[PDB]
């Protein structure tokens, strides 16, 4: 992204939290801020230095310094659970707006729980069909925001990756999964593969190796 935001943040009821977007173009431009709840239309919360649309709660405020734009919620309420996006003019000056990648805000309503991660290698049956999938299963975590990264022999793997957005389990914790697609030759030619799962900045890593 041209504007970078953290994937997720949490806050206890009534406390203050700040969501920040960073980018070189914010040194020269102001940003606008949006809330999007699951399945709902986005709402404009704030723009510039002091513009809050009618109907937006007073606890939402925007600010800017250096290469950062921030949205501060002063007294988080349960209804503030949502994705939050910043937007600003394209760094090129072009007549175009760009968006950050979004920050999932969780207003804590149960205890935090770390992801349980299990990484499976390709099955012998799948390899016999001349395919290979590594399967990274991530369960029982809260808040429901994680980032997943893959590596092989210390090098990030970007191609062949598909990762689900977290979804709530019947036990009210979250689950997610990530898949790395490889040829059988690729699988066998590297020493080890890893799935790294980051939850509020804390990384859990599992590794598998051919044989």
């Amino acid at each position: 992204y041209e504007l970078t935001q953290e994937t997720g943040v949490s806050v206890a009821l009534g406390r203050t939290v700040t969501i920040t977007c960073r980018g070189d173009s914010l040194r020269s431009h102001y940003a606008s801020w949006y809330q999007k709840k699951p399945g709902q239309a986005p709402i404009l919360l704030f723009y510039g230095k002091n513009n809050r649309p009618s109907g937006v709660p007073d606890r939402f405020s925007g600010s800017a310094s250096g290469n950062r734009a921030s949205l501060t919620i002063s007294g988080a309420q349960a209804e503030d659970d949502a994705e939050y996006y910043c937007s600003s003019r394209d760094k090129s000056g072009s007549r175009l707006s760009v968006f950050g990648g979004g920050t999932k805000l969780t207003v804590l309503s149960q205890p935090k729980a770390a992801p349980s991660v299990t990484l499976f290698p390709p099955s012998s049956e799948e390899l016999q069909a001349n395919k290979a999938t590594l399967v990274c299963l991530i369960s029982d975590f809260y808040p429901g925001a994680v980032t997943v990264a893959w590596k092989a022999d210390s090098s990030p793997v970007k191609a062949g990756v598909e990762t689900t957005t977290p979804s709530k389990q019947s036990n009210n914790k979250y689950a997610a999964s990530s898949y790395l697609s490889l040829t059988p030759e690729q699988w066998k030619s590297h020493r080890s593969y890893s799935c790294q799962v980051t939850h509020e900045g804390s990384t859990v890593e599992k590794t598998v190796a051919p044989t």
Partner: protein, 227 residues
């Protein structure tokens, strides 16, 4: 007061075309600049194009990945905004939003000046570009390798959703997780199910995952054995 309702979403094959409509009410449509914004399944928000009001030039602008393929138009007499999408690519799969846009100024000294905010939005409509047709899954075992072991089943390359997974015909529910499916660029889906079992039970208890894909009339069982 303001409402925007996008419609027209659907499944279309690559190379095909689709027209979206956005019906607007609660504001003076003829005065409004309007935009389309989209969100691909995992990757945030992306401006698609805009049309100015008729009192202004009524002209259009488009994002680079979309120029030459998408056309934006408006019928003020029906308070409707359109997005004609032609020569669609897998890359165009996304939720498509209609938005009323506004302008404000910051302290950038460039030209033309002005920030654009998205003052009102619709809920969006899903567009899926895929060459997939109904297809049953292939099922692979995920073999077990504090006194407990995880085993599972990989349910690969099916269409459409959903698949149902049980263990031991429903007798095993404790410690089961069946995960949301992933949508591949092929348009096909894959999902996994895992169960955590006592390690002492491996090789005396049989674990079978039962996979049901109703659109393809597929009902397949797979035994998951230790390595």
């Amino acid at each position: 007061e303001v409402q925007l309702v996008e419609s027209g979403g659907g499944l279309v094959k690559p190379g095909g075309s689709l027209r979206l409509s956005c019906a607007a009410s609660g504001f003076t449509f003829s005065n409004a600049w309007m935009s389309w914004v989209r969100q691909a399944p995992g990757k945030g928000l992306e401006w698609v194009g805009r049309i100015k009001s008729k009192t202004d030039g009524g002209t259009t602008d488009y994002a680079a990945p979309v120029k030459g393929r998408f056309t934006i138009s408006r019928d003020d007499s029906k308070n409707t905004l359109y997005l004609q999408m032609n020569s669609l690519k897998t890359e165009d799969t996304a939720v498509y939003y209609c938005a009323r846009t506004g302008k404000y100024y910051d302290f950038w000294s460039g030209y033309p000046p002005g920030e654009e905010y998205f003052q009102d939005w619709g809920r969006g409509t899903l567009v899926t570009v895929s060459s997939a047709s109904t297809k049953g899954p292939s099922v692979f075992p995920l073999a077990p390798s504090g006194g407990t072991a995880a085993l599972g089943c990989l349910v690969k390359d099916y269409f459409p959703e959903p698949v149902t997974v049980s263990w031991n015909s429903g007798a095993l529910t404790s410690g089961v997780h069946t995960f949301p499916a992933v949508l591949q660029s092929s348009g096909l889906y894959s999902l996994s199910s895992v169960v955590t079992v006592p390690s002492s039970s491996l090789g005396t208890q049989t674990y079978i995952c039962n996979v049901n894909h109703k659109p393809s009339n597929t009902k397949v069982d797979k035994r998951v054995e230790p390595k």
